[PDB]
Amino acid sequence: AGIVGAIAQRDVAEILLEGLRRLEYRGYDSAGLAVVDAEGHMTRLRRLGKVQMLAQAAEEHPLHGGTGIAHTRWATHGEPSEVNAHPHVSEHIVVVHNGIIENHEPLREELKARGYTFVSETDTEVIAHLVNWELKQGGTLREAVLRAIPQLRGAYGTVIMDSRHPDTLLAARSGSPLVIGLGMGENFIASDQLALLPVTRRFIFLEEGDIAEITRRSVNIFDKTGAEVKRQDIESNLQYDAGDKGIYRHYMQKEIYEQPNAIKNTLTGRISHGQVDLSELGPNADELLSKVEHIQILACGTSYNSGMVSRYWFESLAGIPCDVEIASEFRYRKSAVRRNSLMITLSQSGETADTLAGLRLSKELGYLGSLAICNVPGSSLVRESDLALMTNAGTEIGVASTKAFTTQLTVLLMLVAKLSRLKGLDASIEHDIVHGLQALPSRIEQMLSQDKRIEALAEDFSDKHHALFLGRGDQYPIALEGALKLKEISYIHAEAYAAGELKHGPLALIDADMPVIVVAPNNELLEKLKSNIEEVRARGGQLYVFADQDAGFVSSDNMHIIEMPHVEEVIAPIFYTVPLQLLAYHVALIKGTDVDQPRNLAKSVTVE
């Protein structure tokens, strides 16, 4: 969750702990630090719980040494426990890590067979042994690291030291941020610049794929090929104490980048023993929910979009009938209620007039009861419902919704296990869901790390007046939301459509002034769409494709693949939301439109 590292003349323990202190706002369940004196004596401390515990544990120790690293953990692989906390060791190799090594089982078996003992359940540990192994063959720590990085698959921001030679640190970025702090005769590193503020304001941001070798007085960066690459150090002329935007230019930007932590907050207290825990609902909750044979969802705007994603989930993974409807459509028509139907409203604000009216009307129609998914406690929708689940995303200031949407999706995915009807035939469904949920936060961070590419892509839409967003199944509402976002903050006339319907009308519209975007299609779908865009090459039709890099899709001249890292299928819709959010944001930046307060839109529509 959080990384800090120091290489100085002076003792750095207090500096490390203070860094962690400043990273605490990011969800963690444990912390640790390791420092090495000049004689190469390495002292390591790890504790379950808050950074405060770690600091106390440190109170007893003369923690001397000028080199060290430190970490706060958000467990994905192995229960939160002192045993599982970072830094993780392999004798003299010491390692802190953000992210997920997903080829961790292959690597753990291979390293076990080579004579290593895994004392922990983490995925992180294979890094420590691996580097160790790679150093066993010889070379410098840098060379060993270069040999090791390529064997890893997934997300890693990692910092690595050799206690036998404390004058150097190695760091590698791939799917998780790292930034270097330059001092006077000392140097630093962190996953989050806020941690370095107490000791420097001069930073070098590591970019995707970078690998750095840091000493007290040198920084050398380079790519996986050992080829020295250069990055600019820049004074941070930022006012960190100015207001609530923190380091960000826009509320909506901050709310996009805050998504991993908002999600951790949504998850807090709702995973117990590898299972979804919704006990917060009351002792007799399972009592009402067991009776449910049908779900009705009402919402407006982006909330309607999340509902729309959830429909696919409920029906495929929980096998309960689910209906989702624009709230104003529901309030004004005479409907036919399904038997044993649960009424769910989704709303960021809890105050949207159509949605509220929908609920109120439902009061007199024979629903088993109502559940409110909301982001503002004490709002009408929460008060007036039987049950309520808060998204806990923190306040959202941007008029366009971002973290509210993804946290909503998180709650809706947790409902799936607790509302199952496939018998079954289950067990593994809930395990899969919980696994994905556990990975979600760092998966989102993985997406954020692709931002430079999305920024670049934005140039392709900056001057367009139309766009068409395509999706199929659980990705169709993602296209809905991507298209909405582009309408919202860039004022481009972007429209979403079910992928399968492209040829039934919109194909007639396509030309150079109307780019087509597909979100996460499988090979079969892709080939269909590729043929479609062929039909319109002559008018300059461009197909942009957000897809799994594992799929091996290849770009043509009018079909452009924008590869994304692999993810758990069950959370793939939340994952693919991020690049469409980032696209819209970067287009708006280029055009210079009012991102936080788009023309004619309101945060919530509360008057009739």
Ligand X SMILES: O=C[C@H](O)[C@@H](O)[C@H](O)[C@H](O)COP(=O)(O)O
Ligand Y SMILES: O=P(O)(O)OC[C@H]1O[C@H](O)[C@H](O)[C@@H](O)[C@@H]1O
Binding site for ligand X (CB under 6 A): 333-334
Rounded Cα distance, 593 and 247, in Å = 20
Q: What binding mask, one character per residue, do residues 294-333 give for ligand Y by CB under 6 A, x or -?
A: ------xxxx------------------------------
Q: What binding mask, one character per residue, do residues 37-76 give for ligand Y by CB under 6 A, x or -?
A: ----------------------------------------
Residue 75 contacts ligand GLU per CB under 6 A: yes
Adjacent-strand bridge partners of 519: 546
Q: How far is the CB of 301 from ligand Y (least distance, A)?
A: 3
Contact criterion met (CB below 8 Å) for 505 and 607: no
**Closer residue to ligand X, CB minimum distance, 334 or 339:** 334
Rounded Cα distance, 559 and 577, in Å = 21
Check residue 314 and report its DSSP letter.
Answer: I
Residue 100 contacts ligand GLU per CB under 6 A: yes
87 prior amide bond cis, ω within 30? yes
Contact criterion met (CB below 8 Å) for 507 and 336: no
Q: What binding mask, one character per residue, do residues 151-190 give for its own copies by CB under 8 A, x or -?
A: --------------------------------xxxx----
> Which among ligand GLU, ligand X, ligand Y, none contacts residue 334 (Cβ within 5 to 8 A by kind)?
ligand X
Site for its own copies in 409-468 (CB under 8 A): 424, 427-428, 437-439, 441-443, 445-446, 448-449, 451-452
**Pick from 22, 47, 73, 129: which binds ligand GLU (CB under 6 A)?**
73
Rounded Cα distance, 441 and 161, in Å = 26
Helix, strand, or coil here: 498? strand
Contact criterion met (CB below 8 Å) for 516 and 559: no
**Pick from 77, 153, 201, 493: which binds its own copies (CB under 8 A)?**
201
Q: How far is the CB of 183 from ligand Y (least distance, A)?
A: 30
**Pick from 76, 90, 187, 349: which binds ligand Y (CB under 6 A)?**
349
Residue 532 contacts ligand Y per CB under 6 A: no
**Pick from 120, 352, 391, 407: which binds ligand Y (CB under 6 A)?**
352
Q: How far is the CB of 31 from its own copies (least distance, A)?
A: 18
Q: What binding mask, one character per residue, do residues 119-158 give for ligand GLU by CB under 6 A, x or -?
A: ---xxx----------------------------------
Q: How far is the CB of 414 from its own copies (least distance, A)?
A: 12
Rounded Cα distance, 598 and 486, in Å = 11
Adjacent-strand bridge partners of 93: 90, 162
**Closer residue to ligand Y, CB minimum distance, 163 or 306:** 306
Alpha helices in 390-516 (DSSP H): 403-418, 428-448, 451-458, 476-490
Contact criterion met (CB below 8 Å) for 132 and 114: no
Q: How far is the CB of 102 from ligand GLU (least distance, A)?
A: 10
**Angle formed by the axes of helices 51-59 and 13-23, to 10°?**
160
Q: What binding mask, one character per residue, do residues 457-496 give for its own copies by CB under 8 A, x or -?
A: ----------------------------------x-----
> Which among its own copies, ligand Y, ligand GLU, none contacts residue 439 (Cβ within 5 to 8 A by kind)?
its own copies
Long-range contacts of 171-174 (CB under 8 A, 24+ apart): 171/5, 171/206, 171/211, 171/212, 171/214, 172/145, 172/210, 172/211, 172/212, 173/206, 173/207, 173/208, 173/209, 173/210, 173/211, 173/449, 174/99, 174/149, 174/208, 174/209, 174/449
Residue 187 contacts ligand Y per CB under 6 A: no
Q: Residue holding tokens 């009938």?
A: 321
Q: Which residues lie closer than 8 Å to 329 by C-beta, 6 or more apart?
A: none
- CB neighbour burial string for 549-588, b if at least 16 within 10 angstroms, e if fewer: eebebeeeebbebbbbbbbbebbbbbbbbbbbbbbbbbbb
Q: With CB under 8 A as the contact rule, which of the stretches 128-136, 224-232, 299-307, 512-520 interacts with its own copies?
A: 224-232
Rounded Cα distance, 30 and 46, in Å = 8
Phi, psi values for residue 131, rounded to 5°: -45, -45
Residue 279 contacts its own copies per CB under 8 A: no
**Closer residue to ligand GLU, CB minimum distance, 124 or 193:** 124
Please name which of 109, 113, 148 lies closest in space to residue 131, comparing C-alpha atoms: 148
**Pick from 174, 296, 347, 392: which binds ligand Y (CB under 6 A)?**
347
Q: Total residues contacting ligand Y (rule CB under 6 A)? A: 17
Residue 387 contacts ligand GLU per CB under 6 A: no
Q: Which positions touch ligand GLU (CB under 6 A)?
A: 1, 73-78, 84, 97-100, 122-124, 442
